[PDB]
Design a binder for this molecule. Structure first.
Ligand SMILES: NC[C@@H]1O[C@H](O[C@H]2[C@@H](O)[C@H](O[C@@H]3[C@@H](O)[C@H](N)C[C@H](N)[C@H]3O[C@H]3O[C@H](CO)[C@@H](O)[C@H](O)[C@H]3N)O[C@@H]2CO)[C@H](N)[C@@H](O)[C@@H]1O
Ligand SMILES: NC[C@@H]1O[C@H](O[C@H]2[C@@H](O)[C@H](O[C@@H]3[C@@H](O)[C@H](N)C[C@H](N)[C@H]3O[C@H]3O[C@H](CO)[C@@H](O)[C@H](O)[C@H]3N)O[C@@H]2CO)[C@H](N)[C@@H](O)[C@@H]1O
Ligand SMILES: [Mg+2]
Ligand SMILES: [Mg+2]
Ligand SMILES: [Mg+2]
Ligand SMILES: [Mg+2]
Ligand SMILES: [Mg+2]
Ligand SMILES: [Mg+2]
Ligand SMILES: [Mg+2]
Ligand SMILES: [Mg+2]
Ligand SMILES: [Mg+2]
Ligand SMILES: [Mg+2]
Ligand SMILES: [Mg+2]
Ligand SMILES: [Mg+2]
Ligand SMILES: [Mg+2]
Ligand SMILES: [Mg+2]
Ligand SMILES: [Mg+2]
Ligand SMILES: [Mg+2]
Ligand SMILES: [Mg+2]
Ligand SMILES: [Mg+2]
Ligand SMILES: [Mg+2]
Ligand SMILES: [Mg+2]
Ligand SMILES: [Mg+2]
Ligand SMILES: [Mg+2]
Ligand SMILES: [Mg+2]
Ligand SMILES: [Mg+2]
Ligand SMILES: [Mg+2]
Ligand SMILES: [Mg+2]
Ligand SMILES: [Mg+2]
Ligand SMILES: [Mg+2]
Ligand SMILES: [Mg+2]
Ligand SMILES: [Mg+2]
Ligand SMILES: [Mg+2]
Ligand SMILES: [Mg+2]
Ligand SMILES: [Mg+2]
Ligand SMILES: [Mg+2]
Ligand SMILES: [Mg+2]
Ligand SMILES: [Mg+2]
Ligand SMILES: [Mg+2]
Ligand SMILES: [Mg+2]
Ligand SMILES: [Mg+2]
Ligand SMILES: [Mg+2]
Ligand SMILES: [Mg+2]
Ligand SMILES: [Mg+2]
Ligand SMILES: [Mg+2]
Ligand SMILES: [Mg+2]
Ligand SMILES: [Mg+2]
Ligand SMILES: [Mg+2]
Ligand SMILES: [Mg+2]
Ligand SMILES: [Mg+2]
Ligand SMILES: [Mg+2]
Ligand SMILES: [Mg+2]
Ligand SMILES: [Mg+2]
Ligand SMILES: [Mg+2]
Ligand SMILES: [Mg+2]
Ligand SMILES: [Mg+2]
Ligand SMILES: [Mg+2]
Ligand SMILES: [Mg+2]
Ligand SMILES: [Mg+2]
Ligand SMILES: [Mg+2]
Ligand SMILES: [Mg+2]
Ligand SMILES: [Mg+2]
Ligand SMILES: [Mg+2]
Ligand SMILES: [Mg+2]
Ligand SMILES: [Mg+2]
Ligand SMILES: [Mg+2]
Ligand SMILES: [Mg+2]
Ligand SMILES: [Mg+2]
Ligand SMILES: [Mg+2]
Ligand SMILES: [Mg+2]
Ligand SMILES: [Mg+2]
Ligand SMILES: [Mg+2]
Ligand SMILES: [Mg+2]
Ligand SMILES: [Mg+2]
Ligand SMILES: [Mg+2]
Ligand SMILES: [Mg+2]
Ligand SMILES: [Mg+2]
Ligand SMILES: [Mg+2]
Ligand SMILES: [Mg+2]
Ligand SMILES: [Mg+2]
Ligand SMILES: [Mg+2]
Ligand SMILES: [Mg+2]
Ligand SMILES: [Mg+2]
Ligand SMILES: [Mg+2]
Ligand SMILES: [Mg+2]
Ligand SMILES: [Mg+2]
Ligand SMILES: [Mg+2]
Ligand SMILES: [Mg+2]
Ligand SMILES: [Mg+2]
Ligand SMILES: [Mg+2]
Ligand SMILES: [Mg+2]
Ligand SMILES: [Mg+2]
Ligand SMILES: [Mg+2]
Ligand SMILES: [Mg+2]
Ligand SMILES: [Mg+2]
Ligand SMILES: [Mg+2]
Lengths: 76, 183
RNA sequence: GUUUAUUAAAAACACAGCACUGUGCAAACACGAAAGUGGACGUAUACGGUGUGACGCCUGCCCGGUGCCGGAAGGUUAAUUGAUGGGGUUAGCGCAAGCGAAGCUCUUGAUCGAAGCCCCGGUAAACGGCGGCCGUAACUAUAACGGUCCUAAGGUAGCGAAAUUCCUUGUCGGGUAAGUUCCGACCUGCACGAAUGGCGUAAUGAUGGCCAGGCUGUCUCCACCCGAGACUCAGUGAAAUUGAACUCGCUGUGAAGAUGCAGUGUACCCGCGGCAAGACGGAAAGACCCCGUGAACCUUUACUAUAGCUUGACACUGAACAUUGAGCCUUGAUGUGUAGGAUAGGUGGGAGGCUUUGAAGUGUGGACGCCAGUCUGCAUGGAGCCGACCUUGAAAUACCACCCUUUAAUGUUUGAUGUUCUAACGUUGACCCGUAAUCCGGGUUGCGGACAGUGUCUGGUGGGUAGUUUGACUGGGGCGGUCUCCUCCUAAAGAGUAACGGAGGAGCACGAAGGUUGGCUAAUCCUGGUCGGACAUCAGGAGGUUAGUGCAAUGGCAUAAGCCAGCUUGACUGCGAGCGUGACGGCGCGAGCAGGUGCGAAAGCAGGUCAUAGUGAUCCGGUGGUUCUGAAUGGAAGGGCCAUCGCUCAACGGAUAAAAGGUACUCCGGGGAUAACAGGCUGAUACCGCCCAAGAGUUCAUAUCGACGGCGGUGUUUGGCACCUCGAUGUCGGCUCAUCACAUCCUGGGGCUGAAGUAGGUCCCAAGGGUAUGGCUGUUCGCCAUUUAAAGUGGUACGCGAGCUGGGUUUAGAACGUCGUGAGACAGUUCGGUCCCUAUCUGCCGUGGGCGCUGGAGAACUGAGGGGGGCUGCUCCUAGUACGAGA
RNA sequence: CACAGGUGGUCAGGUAGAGAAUACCAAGGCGCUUGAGAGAACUCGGGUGAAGGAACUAGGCAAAAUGGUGCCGUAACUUC
RNA sequence: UUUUGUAUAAUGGGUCAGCGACUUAUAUUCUGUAGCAAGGUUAACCGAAUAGGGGAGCCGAAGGGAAACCGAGUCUUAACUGGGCGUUAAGUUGCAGGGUAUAGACCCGAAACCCGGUGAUCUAGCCAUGGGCAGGUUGAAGGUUGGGUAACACUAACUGGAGGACCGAACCGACUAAUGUUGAAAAAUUAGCGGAUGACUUGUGGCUGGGGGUGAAAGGCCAAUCAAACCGGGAGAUAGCUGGUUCUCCCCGAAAGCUAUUUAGGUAGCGCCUCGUGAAUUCAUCUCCGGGGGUAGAGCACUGUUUCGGCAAGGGGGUCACUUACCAACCCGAUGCAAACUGCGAAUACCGGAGAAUGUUAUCACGGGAGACACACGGCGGGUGCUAACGUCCGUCGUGAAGAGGGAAACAACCCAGACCGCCAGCUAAGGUCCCAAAGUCAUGGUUAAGUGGGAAACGAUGUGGGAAGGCCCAGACAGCCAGGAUGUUGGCUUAGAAGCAGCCAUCAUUUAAAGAAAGCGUAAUAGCUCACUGGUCGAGUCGGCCUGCGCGGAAGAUGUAACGGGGCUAAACCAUGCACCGAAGCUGCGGCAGCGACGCUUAUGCGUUGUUGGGUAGGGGAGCGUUCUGUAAGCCUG
């Protein structure tokens, strides 16, 4: 039976939110699935983390027919 | 673990008592007690099997005992089956009800007979006491093979006691009224 | 007999007696780095060691384990010897690249090598051990009997509820009015048992248990008397203790048990004699318990050393002959797979050597030999057996090479054993002188003799000795369990978030299961369909990702991340804008840049795997590369820089390369941070009461009861908690003295009764008083005997040790069972085992002094108020009446 | 400590006595370096105790009790 | 003192006086200060000596790299679009202070470890050499004699005098009980007690020495001490523990957390405090703007759990694959439940952009000094537990801690509120206003009659208020009184009897105003008998559900009323409204001190007005007092 163990916290989540500043390369969201997806200039990594490929403002949104969430970067 | 020998100890015990009850059933007190005949070897016309499969073992009074039957061509056939069977009962062929009387507690019966039940009681205890011995031998054993905690032993060595103790209470209190059937 | 001087005198130790074992005398053994000494001025009828413990009847089976006593064939091995190869250097050959002579040197470690161990054998009055299960007898029960498994092997004699028995106060018997003890049985021996002796035994015993007469103030139940204190007078004159005191009760409050707080009640001031309920009174930094990377001694197959014991080598250490364990070996042999003109070398040369420079095979003088066979010293033999033969995975002792198996002798050569010798060395034989000397030296002589012994080196042995280690978390500790890593929930819609909280998984896998290009799309149901079922595959429809993801969980995933194929190595090297997450060490994501690949027509994609586990610092050292370093210089060695290797260091930030335990013989530093007593919190549990009413009650739910369920009260059981106390709050029972509650045992007053009477039942009211002696056990308790009107239930530190007791219970002694290799251990049992304190305060029982009460004094009172007392049987008349069939 | 403790050897009177026990005495030596009174509880040490006689208690703890000589006389058991 | 917390019945102190604990040396770093400055400074030594010499040397002006080397660059790499570390920052030597390293390193303190000595005048054992044992018993071997024998065996006296033998003083011992327990005594006294010819006892001297002895063995004894003697040493062993730590005033002011730890009552980094240096509107509140949420709640499509119905494979049973009373998945409809369900989904919270006010920079960075890593209660959200605990484990806030004052009787942790100092002045908070006891026996409208208030539940009751509706009723209701209450008919009835009748079955069927084949008393069965129902009588109300306030039973504990703090209250309780007042260290008013700013007078800034701040434990920072001693001092005070 014997319970009483667990992993470390892996400190996931959103790291920079809507319309934050953020320079290229910065991480926007850690996640396990692609709960969010990669929008414009935001390349998803092998983590599934979404960073940014351009200085700019973060933008959450939801396009398409599966109605899924995309993180864009509005150019700046 | 302890579980399946706590319940094992238990069945062995309260089925230990239900032999005592069963062997202070083959004695003859003053009282009628139809379960006296209702455990008697008897032949009839093909095969053994008790008289259960034939007659009603009823009563007429504390000191007598009617045998209501169906079929009246085996009245002597059983009469001998009953009147030679280590009891000492001469059945009257008054017809219809094989009258088996209950001769009184002759005092050399209120005693010496009594001595038998409270001896038969004692050996029933001993059997229980020995279920005890075993039950926690298993316990003690599966301890020195580190599968129990001292505490878990101790709480299992008692409680086995609780099983013995209660099980004796049944033996002792089933004997105790059975003693009233003479005292 | 002896012993814990100073809590244990015993059953403990000793004992005579028994046995095992070691010792040939320079004894074993002991004290002594040694000399020497004891043993003993003794000599196996002796001396040492170990266990047993007069005597009697006796002392069984087990050698597997651990020991000890024997062994040798090998296997494994020390110092040593230093074969053999590798490397450094550099005379010289070199266009230079390299090469590399001797020597010196760093390696490697052939060969030799004793005991030990491995192994084989013995030994239990060595340590020690002496089983399970399944069945079986005309009814039951049991099992003389059978089966099976497991052992070294499975408890014989005797004994057994015991110094041993848990359940246990076992059962039966005796003894008693009554017997948890005692005695006699039984055997169901938790867990007796044969010299860590078994079972008996007259005598002994300040030894353990039980009984009986006598005796008694031990006790019903105390009385009186004589003395020493106590009390008063005079003289002398202490003590512990002490923050400060103007030092009451009660109920609450409060760091949780109040002289000191709140409320209230009572109380003129001060002594003397008395009592010990309280000041968590005095005394001693609690012994129990826990904590300290504390201490000691102690044990041991803990670790590491070590004296001792033991093996060999070298030295002291010489002269002679012989034997043989042997690595190997020229003269040369050693030899039937299945089908043989046969006891067939791995497989080959290959076309006359021996004859003429002495040879068949028919005897077998030597003989191997599995008594199945044969080479053929010397010749007998007196000019050719015969071979690629037609069989054979392959053709000839037809000639000859080193020889996988086996076997045999030079030279000598690895080294082991023996004898002889005398001159080293020993002499704890005799004699001689120093010398009127059992020491010493010298001398003579006999014995021994290169041995013994000693020194250096070396293997083993080594609790004899010594130093240490033996983790933590923990609802005290221990026991269990846990210790890193990943996923979900607890987690309160960012992150994070704890418990010995609820659940699971990881310590890997894959050269494709990685890369890219191209392609593809599940589960489930319904219907049809050979074997074919709920489900194998096929068909179609519904379905729409419920499937699938190498694997836990969660997040993902159709543009699939799921499934197939072709081509492939981006499971690339250097770097890295900028972020994530960590106290840190670190860990993670990343576009882009350089170079160089793969895939695609191309756009592009690829720095491993849908993602999140799959792991180990630093030191130390190995390997490969690299002139970076180079102790005068040249080189080298070693060091550095890159790449990489060695760890369940899992107690997973890893104290050491290297480690278990006992302490009741104990110790110290600490803690009410932390258990045990008592208090406090709680009230699950307990106990007491109530709500519903199927049902019992012949009929009738509630006279008396009450199933399935339900609600409370108390603080009162079992518990939970760890607030108080560890610079000390003495624990059970007894005694004495108590005091309160009422949930009333008796007595008193009532209701209902399934109350005729008598006597019961149940309920209400009532706390005035009263409420047993004994047997048994330390017991409270309880059962038992016998009374009584009754033998009430609780609280009071489970009332009451500065009041007594000390039987229980926890110190040190001892022993049995059981556990352990042992030290020791038991919430098992047995025998023994120091109980201090002169009363300041409070309180209390008594008894005086002072003052007040209004001028003082003598009496007698009134009685506000306080206390004491408050129990109950029997007989009788009423009356043998009411009632009753009677009793 | 002018401490009811410890300390080896010598001597051995009278009466009773088995005696070096014990009581009284001799020889010799002493009354123990606070007295005086009182005549309560309670403690200490002691005397006697009606009836009962272990009912006490863990337990006959303590006390009470037996006690000399001579002669008769004495069971199981026994290693005699 | 220690603690979450102490009047605490937890530590310590009988009182006084005197002494008694953060130092010294050397390095090292920071700060303050002084000199000199891309320089600074010397050490030993010399010295004619605090001078002056002496520049050996140290620090610094250059770094990067492992190094060779290169150099304001270097390293990395083939090279970097680049990256790491440097160049843009003055240093150094004294003096004073804050830390740290080595030292005993604030002070006191273990149990112990090692070295060397002194101890067998106590005691254990042994070795020489001398003593001691009154008195009384028993009567071994041996001898003699006699009996006995065929001879022996055998037996009897007498003699003899054995024994870890018997009783018992001295002597040796120590089993029991009392006493004594600040003793007469640091182990005894008194009454009993074991040994007392022996493995006895004792005098003198001797020998054995500390991991050693000795031990008829207890870990016993070795000088009142022994699981390792005493004395001196190493030695101020070590003490992550306990205790203690001494003058005054000012400013700030924590923590009981995370992470790691042979770690848990210790320590380290981080967090929090203090001080310094420096830096941007840094930071916070609110506003609007840009965000992600999957919690509360709800829902049941998914995952699972669940009840009814419909539908149904199959499962369970009757056949000789069929029917089926029965448990039945899926689908459908109705209905619930979930921390590890979600097709929904808040309030808050958090992030970010902007902006104004306010805020003594509240912010970040760096540096000097720390402290702390035992928490506690309360509110809210939870795991645990029993939605038990003054329980335990997290989150979040508040308070205590480290905060006084008023309130809650008393009551760290609740309510109110943050105490610089003086006031015989004022307003308030919470809580109060009959007396104790400051303020209403205040005003108005209700309720309760239980001392409810001022303790307790299921459940029970014509208590007593308020509200909206009902049924019945002068064609006479509700109660009460008068009457009738009959007949199928015993009802058939397994009926021994029931005919209402424990039972039996139905309950339909006559009659009149009305009467059940039956409500109970109830009989052996009848049944005597009241009911229901109805006629009369009387004469105006009566019946019982719903919503609702307050009250009643249910309600028993232990020292003493003791369950409002008390008296006492019928309002002095309760509900509603109003207005007064009392109440604190809060706010205000005077007067004063200090830190920080601002304006005006004015400089080393005094200052006037003014703004503001001034609880405090660990702890940081600042400024003083006084003691002894040196100079000033052959000065000054002083018979
Ligand atoms: N029997 C051999 C002996 O060798 C001796 O010589 C010794 C040395 O001289 C000789 O060393 C030589 C060296 O000199 C010469 N230059 C090179 C040779 N390889 C070395 O040989 C040595 O070194 C090699 C490793 O390199 C090792 O295997 C081993 O030590 C030895 N063989 O090796 C011998 C010892 O190892 C004498 N010549 C003599 O006593 C006798 O011959
Ligand atoms: N000692 C006297 C004897 O004890 C005997 O006791 C024996 C029995 O109780 C019992 O015997 C059983 C046997 O009955 C049963 N049916 C089969 C079982 N294998 C036997 O077992 C016996 O024998 C075998 C050897 O064959 C052993 O392995 C085992 O240890 C032993 N217990 O084992 C005991 C022997 O160890 C019997 N009571 C009887 O023969 C006699 O009284
Ligand atoms: Mg004796
Ligand atoms: Mg003693
Ligand atoms: Mg001997
Ligand atoms: Mg013995
Ligand atoms: Mg034996
Ligand atoms: Mg017995
Ligand atoms: Mg034994
Ligand atoms: Mg014995
Ligand atoms: Mg006096
Ligand atoms: Mg109190
Ligand atoms: Mg009080
Ligand atoms: Mg007094
Ligand atoms: Mg202590
Ligand atoms: Mg040791
Ligand atoms: Mg621990
Ligand atoms: Mg969260
Ligand atoms: Mg895959
Ligand atoms: Mg593709
Ligand atoms: Mg199908
Ligand atoms: Mg060189
Ligand atoms: Mg050199
Ligand atoms: Mg002991
Ligand atoms: Mg001991
Ligand atoms: Mg201690
Ligand atoms: Mg506590
Ligand atoms: Mg207490
Ligand atoms: Mg706690
Ligand atoms: Mg706590
Ligand atoms: Mg005390
Ligand atoms: Mg009552
Ligand atoms: Mg009742
Ligand atoms: Mg008694
Ligand atoms: Mg009794
Ligand atoms: Mg008796
Ligand atoms: Mg008590
Ligand atoms: Mg006492
Ligand atoms: Mg005792
Ligand atoms: Mg007294
Ligand atoms: Mg005197
Ligand atoms: Mg004296
Ligand atoms: Mg005398
Ligand atoms: Mg005197
Ligand atoms: Mg007197
Ligand atoms: Mg007397
Ligand atoms: Mg008397
Ligand atoms: Mg008398
Ligand atoms: Mg008598
Ligand atoms: Mg008694
Ligand atoms: Mg006595
Ligand atoms: Mg006497
Ligand atoms: Mg405390
Ligand atoms: Mg504190
Ligand atoms: Mg207080
Ligand atoms: Mg006090
Ligand atoms: Mg105090
Ligand atoms: Mg105290
Ligand atoms: Mg004190
Ligand atoms: Mg002596
Ligand atoms: Mg004697
Ligand atoms: Mg004697
Ligand atoms: Mg004694
Ligand atoms: Mg005496
Ligand atoms: Mg002594
Ligand atoms: Mg020691
Ligand atoms: Mg010290
Ligand atoms: Mg030292
Ligand atoms: Mg750790
Ligand atoms: Mg919800
Ligand atoms: Mg259904
Ligand atoms: Mg949140
Ligand atoms: Mg904002
Ligand atoms: Mg600042
Ligand atoms: Mg620090
Ligand atoms: Mg800590
Ligand atoms: Mg903590
Ligand atoms: Mg906390
Ligand atoms: Mg809570
Ligand atoms: Mg207050
Ligand atoms: Mg209160
Ligand atoms: Mg107050
Ligand atoms: Mg108000
Ligand atoms: Mg007032
Ligand atoms: Mg009024
Ligand atoms: Mg009340
Ligand atoms: Mg009417
Ligand atoms: Mg009520
Ligand atoms: Mg009001
Ligand atoms: Mg006012
Ligand atoms: Mg005021
Ligand atoms: Mg103020
Ligand atoms: Mg002012
Ligand atoms: Mg202030
Ligand atoms: Mg402040
Ligand atoms: Mg302050």
């Amino acid at each position: 039976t014997r319970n009483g163990r667990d992993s470390e916290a892996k400190r996931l989540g959103v790291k920079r939110f809507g319309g934050e500043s953020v320079l290229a390369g910065s991480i926007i969201v850690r996640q396990r699935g692609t709960k969010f997806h990669a929008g414009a200039n935001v390349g998803c990594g092998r983590d599934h983390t979404l960073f940014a490929k351009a200085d700019g403002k973060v933008k959450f949104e939801v396009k398409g027919p599966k109605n899924r969430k995309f993180i864009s970067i509005e150019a700046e | 673990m302890i579980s399946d020998i706590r319940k094992d100890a238990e069945v062995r015990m309260d089925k230990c008592v239900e032999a005592f009850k069963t062997q202070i059933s083959k004695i003859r007190t003053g009282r009628a007690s139809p379960s006296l005949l209702d455990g008697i070897v008897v032949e009839y016309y093909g095969t053994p099997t008790p008289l259960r499969q034939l007659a009603s073992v009823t009563v007429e009074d504390s000191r007598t005992l009617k045998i209501n039957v169906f079929d009246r061509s085996m009245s002597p056939a059983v009469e001998k089956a009953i009147m030679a069977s280590d009891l000492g009962l001469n059945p009257n062929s008054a017809g219809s009800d094989i009258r088996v009387p209950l001769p009184p507690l002759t005092e050399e019966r209120r005693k010496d007979l009594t001595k038998i039940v409270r001896g038969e009681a004692e050996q029933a205890r001993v059997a229980v006491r020995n279920v005890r011995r075993d039950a926690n031998d298993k316990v003690k054993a599966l301890l020195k093979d580190k599968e129990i905690s001292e505490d878990d032993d101790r709480r299992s060595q008692d409680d086995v006691q609780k099983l013995t103790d209660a099980a004796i209470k049944k033996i002792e209190a089933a004997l105790a009224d059975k003693e009233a059937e003479l005292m």
